[PDB]
Amino acid sequence: TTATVLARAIAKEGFDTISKGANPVEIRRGVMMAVETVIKELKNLSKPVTTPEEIAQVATISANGDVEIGNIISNAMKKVGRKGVITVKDGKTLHDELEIIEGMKFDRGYISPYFINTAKGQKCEFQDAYLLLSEKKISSVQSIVPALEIANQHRKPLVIVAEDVDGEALSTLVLNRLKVGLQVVAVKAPGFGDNRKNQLRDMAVATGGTVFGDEAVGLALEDIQAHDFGKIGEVQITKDDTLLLKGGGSPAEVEKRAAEIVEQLENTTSDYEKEKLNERLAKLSDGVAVLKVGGTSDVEVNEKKDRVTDALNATRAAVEEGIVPGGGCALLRCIPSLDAIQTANADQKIGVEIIRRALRIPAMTIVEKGIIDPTKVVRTALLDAA
Amino acid sequence: TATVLARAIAKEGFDTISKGANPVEIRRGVMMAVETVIKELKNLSKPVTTPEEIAQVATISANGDVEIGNIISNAMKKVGRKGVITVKDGKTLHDELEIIEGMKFDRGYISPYFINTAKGQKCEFQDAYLLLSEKKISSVQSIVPALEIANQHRKPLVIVAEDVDGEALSTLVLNRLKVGLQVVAVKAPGFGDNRKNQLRDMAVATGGTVFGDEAVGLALEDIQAHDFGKIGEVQITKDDTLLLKGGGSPAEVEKRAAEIVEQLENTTSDYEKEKLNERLAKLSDGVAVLKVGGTSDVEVNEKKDRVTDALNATRAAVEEGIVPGGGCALLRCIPSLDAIQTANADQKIGVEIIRRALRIPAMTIMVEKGIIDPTKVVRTALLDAA
């Protein structure tokens, strides 16, 4: 391990010699104060995107003036909402189609990247899958194998949603997926506290499944039967998101669940609890906008589907945090805000000066004319670079 | 835009911190010092040649485990200090040693999506087919008939070619990911005529045929089952490929070895003697298989990791020797830094960085429990810092 100690010294003593004994913690503090100040200024320059027109304008310039892509995006955002669920699919027709189907999305991705089965976009895509819902963590082999056996003997992919999947249970899932191509994926349950348990129950109703380990039934995972699984017509899991389309739950059961949420909505004075109940109610009642891209051939629609997805993600990022001048002009215009920064040391000065000098570089390398970048993209680009 | 920002922060960050120093001249001083240090390392190194010295190194790298040191030294007694040694799980209580036929070359899988074993990021197959090609593989229709033959015989397929790219690689990746197609692609080793010779050597060892060669010119589409090579066991990492128990007959292997020893006789080039001797060791010399036993699968997996670590440290020690004293040995290289002739103030800085870091490993003083340091591990760590 002499090699490991020697490498950490060259890195450590390399800073002290080059910087003439500067404090790295205070330099990092200078970078963080400058970055926070630039981002705060970025929120000032940003212009919101909420109106249907200015959404279409942003969506049009997001697709390089395709108009057809811009209008099919704004039309989807009209029928499903500014923050509604929109997904892109391959249409078998000549023109672009828009359809609203049953489904929902939540912000948790696959627990392991080995569950990837689609290199394009690094996603896990299944059709007609089983859904295993667990209110407790799944850590042991004994608690996950019976569910794998039933799914595998039915030749149905298996989506597992639990508080967490770790330990030997996760190792077993990765082993079978990698070694013998078992169609399986595991994701963490969204939310916290009772809201997490309620969201799990909502999935069971929407997909016709059962939640294991809940306080009510106390169903053991080793006693799983086939009908305990939920059913999903289509699954699409990325490293950040999970999309469940066309659940197997009957519309009557969905409606009774919406009635309980409506009852709780009139039984609380808390604004936060109402916010969570309304998010759950919308996930159950609202659908998913599906953009079916059409064209002349199967090779052309695949190329057009990508340009639609890229314009879709950029438009979604604009309705979130707004838009700023593109070409690096926004970062160049946040530089004078750094002169107001009150630091303590000369090392904090160095950190600010590093940001002050680097903000000109992206612009030096390069609204009504389409020269626009979304605020979210330019802000996260600065946080990750720093 | 995020990479430009990240590079701009690193570039302008070094300037602001170093008060306007030349990064090239500093790096030149770092590499100049590392060069002289490595010279003193090799002069000070002690070789590992004797069976007792090999076992001593393996025992210390096994935390004093004499049994692990014994089985590593025994494996080297049978296949030589530079022979191929692999580690496997054993079905008995103790460790076994088995000499089998096989070969290993320094080319890994073309895409990490071919991994089917998370532990060590490996692709492992048993009783597999081997497709060999002197030309690049790019089209799907060229490999589609080879795939159906492998699917009909229910055999994994290893593809060793000049390269596998284009739509052929993408559909191989897509089929592996989506439907669990057991396939892996590896670049052919060597260059020029030597690469053609090693490919033909692989065909003889496995009983297959090289497609697209200059002698026959067999097309990939005219493939028949007997054109495949047969391998008993395949282990492919990101850097290496191990083919065990090839299906070639002993007679054709003896003939191929007779051609190499004939060319070995009529050559004076030490580099060509090395190239032909490397080919002869692959075709003739055997592979040592260490089967690690235990009373439980947890103990076997744990012991297999310690045997692998001790083996890697022993192989590194056999190649370049061991460092006597470990950290204290780097102290004898510091006086050699005082003779380096620097040019500009930034070059003296780079030398001073190394002079500071070398003093540390001894200043801190595993070492009390007895550890050795292979000269290769220390040398590569110094080069990786410059």
Numbering used by the authors:
A (entry chain B): 114 to 479, 514 to 533
B (entry chain A): 115 to 479, 513 to 533
What do the authors of the reporting publication say about this deposited model?
Mitochondrial Hsp60 (mtHsp60) plays a crucial role in maintaining the proper folding of proteins in the mitochondria. mtHsp60 self-assembles into a ring-shaped heptamer, which can further form a double-ring tetradecamer in the presence of ATP and mtHsp10. The crystal structure of mtHsp60 reveals three domains: apical, intermediate, and equatorial domains. The equatorial domain connects the subunits in the heptameric ring and facilitates interactions between the two rings of tetradecamers. Our results showed that the E. coioides mtHsp60 (EcHsp60) forms dimers that are incapable of hydrolyzing ATP but can reassemble into heptamers, thus restoring ATPase activity.
To understand the molecular basis of the inactivation of dimeric EcHsp60, the crystal structure of the naïve EcHsp602 was solved at a resolution of 2.35 Å. The dimeric structure of the naïve EcHsp60 (EcHsp602) revealed a twofold symmetrical conformation, with two protomers facing each other in an asymmetric unit. The N-terminal (MIS and residues 1–87) and the C-terminal (residues 508–552) regions of both protomers were not observed in the density maps because of their disordered structure, and only a partial equatorial domain was built in this model. The α4 helix of each subunit protruded out from its equatorial domain to interact with the adjacent subunit, with the interface mainly composed of van der Waals forces and hydrophobic interactions. Two intermolecular polar contacts were identified on the α4 helix of each subunit, involving residues T89, E100, D103, R444, and D494. The RLK motif (R264-K266) located at the α9 terminus formed four hydrogen bonds with residues from another protomer, including E212, R264, L265, and K266. In contrast, neither the naïve nor the mature EcHsp602 showed any ATP hydrolysis activity at any ATP concentration. The oligomeric conformation of the R264AK266A mutant was confirmed by negative-stain TEM, which showed that it formed a heptameric ring structure similar to the WT naïve EcHsp607. These results suggest that the RLK motif is crucial for stabilizing the dimeric form of EcHsp60.
